[PDB]
Each structure stands twice: as C-alpha cells, then as structure tokens.
C-alpha cells in the first residue's frame, strides 16, 4: 500500500560520517515538507556477516573489519578512492542492512516500494571497494529479492556505469541490468559500451547506454523510456531495483550531464506504473543540496504529490540559497548527443533483447 521509508536517527549519523550530512540533509528536507507523514517508517537493521556474504568474499569483509596503510588494502581496493577509515565496517554493514531490509519488506507484501536514499553504492565487487563503494547493496537487495522474484530489473541511472552490480550478475538470466551512464575514454569506470551484453548464459542480460555530455530532460527520458519499453516486453521483469545517484543533475561538479530531477521523475514515473514491487536507491550526488532537492521531489513523485516550490524552513534551510527553490535549472552548455549516435544505440539494443525470453 503505502511506501515504507527505510530511517532511523542512528542511521542517518552512521550515514553522516565524501557526503558529509547529506543524509540528515536528504531526510530533513523530506521531513520539511513532511512526507514521512504518508510513508510507514521502518527502522532499518545491521547487516549480519552472513547476509554480508551473500555477495562478498569472507577474505573481503574480515579485512574490512579489521582496518576499521595496512599492507593488504591495496588489493582489496582500499586507498585513493576508498580510504580506509575507522568504523567504516559499520557505516558498510548499516548500508547494506538497509537494502537488505527493504527487500524483506518488498518479499513480505508490506508495500510496492522501499525507500533507502543512503544506499545505491554500485561500484563495489565481491572482494574490493571501488569508487568510493565499500559494500555493495545493491546486490545484496537483488539477493534478497532472489528469495521470492524469478526476475529481478537492475535499472542504474547514476552518471556512471553500474559495474559491480552487472559484474555480479553478468554470468546470469535471472537479473537483468541497465546502465545508461556517461561513456567516453578516461570516464570512471570505463566499462559499459553498448556491446556489452554480459558473458555466457547472461550474454544479453546486462544493457548499457552510453551517453555523452550535456544531455538534459527530454532527450534523457527519450532514451530511458524507448530503452525499458523494450526491455519490460522482452523480459518482463517481477521485481525491479532503481538506483537514482544525482551526480547527472545540472550543478553536480561532476560537471557532464545537465539534468533536472523532473526528467529523472519522468524516467521514475515510467517505471512506478508497471506496478511491481520496486526498491529505491539513491547513490552518487556531490552538489548536496541539489541531491536533497532531487530525492526529495522524488520521493513527492512516488507519493503522488506535487510539493511546493519554496524550500519549507527545516535545519539545513540556509545551504538552498540565495533562491531558496526546489526546482533546478540545467547550465548553459551543450547537449553532446548527436541523434542519429543515439538511434544506433537503441537499435543496437532492440536487436540484442530479441535475443532475450521469457
Ligand atoms: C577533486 N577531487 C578530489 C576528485 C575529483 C574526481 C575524482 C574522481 O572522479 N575519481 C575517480 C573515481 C570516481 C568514482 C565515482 C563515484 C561515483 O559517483 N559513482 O557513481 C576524485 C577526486
Ligand atoms: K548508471
Ligand atoms: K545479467
Ligand atoms: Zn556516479
């Protein structure tokens, strides 16, 4: 029935010690124009080390335990992008129960949709951190979900590539995932061209759309749409797990895409009216009242209701300055997509989900 909001104050100061507040900034905007109000509030729990390795390797989790300049770290992706730093095993195990937990919620009939705005961290493999991801979520919820859905939907509208969660999966039909990322030579991760399909019995079961800069709202829901459309018919999926990092969202200092959170609402609202059971994440997002902006309006689209324009006073009300609004402008800059590099994207696509059944 009515969405189930994954929070609790421990929580959110586990979340709070890269993106330093911006989780009591996300949750206190939501509470501003209280929309925890129309959602059922569930205390997330701890992920145990068993659930924990569903997905990671024991080696992985023991070394993170322990250095929360260790010799190993290097080969467990610890250091320049993921420092190691104290407690962060707990701030890991407190993201990934959080998933966890809304995907039981999701299995048990308790709502449609789960909310957990402090997860999203698809970069991590089964033994390293990568980019700034210590611990994967994502997949831990998908193997949740793997409980109870023959078919589960992995849908990354990060700017970047959703890699560990397609690496996860890349060898498998029972998970689908979809990328649409910025691609282009020296852009982190990397991976993610068109071509790749996934590997094996999953060739064909992982979808990548690379776009280039600037794009913005309607170009963007072009693609988004015409993409699941074709997917939703080929692999019509039973449950569906949506990250919705806000580092493609004009102002970011990421600096590529030029959305707003209306055009990713579009991309939202298409796939909130299939009516599966739908976990939400959050992710990336370095313009942090920009991304409390975004997730907040977001979480308005999941509830039906459209917020007002003015920034409601709350905690944080001085960082939506000097204009104090909600909606974002896109920048001045040039969209990169030329139109016919894009149709031979979607072409390239419709041919590979023909190979798709069931
Ligand atoms: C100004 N400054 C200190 C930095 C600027 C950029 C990076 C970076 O992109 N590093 C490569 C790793 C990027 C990981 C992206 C994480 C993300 O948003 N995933 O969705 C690092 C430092
Ligand atoms: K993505
Ligand atoms: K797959
Ligand atoms: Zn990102």
Redesign the pocket.
Same mark, same amino acid.
């Given at each position: 029935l009515v969405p189930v909001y994954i929070y609790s104050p421990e929580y959110v100061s586990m979340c709070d010690s890269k993106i330093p507040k911006r989780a009591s900034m996300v949750h206190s905007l939501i509470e501003a124009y209280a929309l925890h109000k129309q959602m059922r509030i569930v205390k997330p729990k701890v992920a145990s080390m068993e659930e924990m390795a569903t997905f990671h390797t024991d080696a992985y989790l023991q070394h993170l335990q322990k250095v929360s300049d260790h010799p190993d770290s290097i080969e467990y992706g610890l250091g320049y992008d993921c420092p190691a730093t104290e407690g962060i095993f707990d701030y890991a195990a407190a993201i990934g129960g959080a998933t966890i937990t809304a995907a039981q919620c999701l299995i048990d009939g308790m709502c449609k949709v789960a909310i957990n705005w402090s997860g999203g961290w698809h970069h991590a493999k089964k033994d390293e951190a990568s980019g700034f991801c210590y611990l994967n979520d994502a997949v831990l919820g998908i193997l949740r979900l793997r409980r109870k859905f023959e078919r589960i939907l992995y849908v990354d509208l $990060?700017?970047?590539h959703g890699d560990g969660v397609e690496d996860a999966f890349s060898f498998t039909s029972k998970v689908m995932t979809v990328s649409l990322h910025k691609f282009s030579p020296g852009f982190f991760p990397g991976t993610g061209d068109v071509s790749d399909v996934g590997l094996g019995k999953g060739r064909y079961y992982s979808v990548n759309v690379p776009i280039q800069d600037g794009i913005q709202d309607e170009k963007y829901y072009q693609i988004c749409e015409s993409v699941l459309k074709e997917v939703y018919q080929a692999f019509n999926p039973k449950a569906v797990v949506l990250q919705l #990092?806000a $580092?493609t969202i004009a102002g970011d200092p990421?600096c590529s895409f030029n959305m707003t959170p209306v055009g990713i609402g579009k991309c939202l609202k298409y796939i909130l009216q299939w009516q599966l059971a739908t976990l939400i994440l959050g #992710?990336?997002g370095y313009n942090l009242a920009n991304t409390a902006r975004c997730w907040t309006y977001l979480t308005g689209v999941i509830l039906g209701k459209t917020l007002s324009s003015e920034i409601p006073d709350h905690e944080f009300f001085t960082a939506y300055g000097p204009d104090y609004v909600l909606e974002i402008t896109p920048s001045c800059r040039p969209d990169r997509n030329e139109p016919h590099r894009i149709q031979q994207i979607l072409n390239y696509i419709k041919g590979n989900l023909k190979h798709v059944v069931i």
């Open positions: $990060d700017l970047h #990092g $580092d990421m #992710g990336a």
